[PDB]
């Protein structure tokens, strides 16, 4: 399903985006839980990637969540774990952002992301969850001058420029975490 990320519209500027060589697809897990196991679950979320496999190195990435829920660091205090998507990437870092964002960075020397999971992650749903709720958890986007939205090759060239410019107008699978509402 094509959709952009969340945010601030991306500038493709005068790109032909839809002849973007390399087309990503980002995607965050959709789960859903029983209304037994929901109140106060530990979930484990993951952002993944497909279709940028040997494509890609330079990525900055905000994921933002419904304020209810609450980000759980690790034992070791890390916000986020790479996951195999991001195996042979030289640089991965996850950082605070905001009460209910964090910030991911990857980079490398040479064109080597994979598809697969790249960021994994705890979010706590709320004590008071009840069947039918649903709290989206989201790849946003905004102009910024550090920490830049990025998902691009080591030489930002012109492939670099359109594989990112799919990505956050048309590339973003959006996820969440809801309860199964009651059968009849």
Do not use: C
């Amino acid at each position: 399903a094509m959709g952009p990320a969340a945010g601030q519209a991306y500038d493709a500027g005068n790109l032909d985006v839809a002849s973007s060589p390399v087309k990503p697809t980002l995607s965050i897990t959709k789960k859903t839980l029983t209304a037994a196991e929901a109140p106060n679950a530990k979930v484990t979320m993951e952002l993944s990637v497909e279709g940028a496999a040997d494509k890609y190195a330079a990525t900055g990435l905000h994921i933002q969540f419904d304020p209810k829920l609450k980000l759980i660091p690790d034992e070791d205090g890390a916000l986020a774990t790479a996951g195999r998507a991001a195996r042979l990437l030289e640089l991965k870092k996850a950082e605070a952002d905001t009460d209910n964002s964090f910030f991911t960075a990857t980079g490398s020397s040479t064109n080597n992301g994979k598809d697969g999971v790249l960021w994994s992650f705890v979010l706590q749903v709320p004590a008071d969850a009840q069947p039918g709720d649903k709290y989206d958890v989201q790849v946003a986007y905004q102009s910024r001058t550090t920490n830049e939205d990025l998902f691009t090759n080591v030489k930002k060239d012109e492939e670099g420029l359109l594989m990112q410019a799919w990505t956050f107008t048309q590339g973003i699978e959006q996820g969440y975490i809801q309860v199964e509402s009651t059968t009849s």
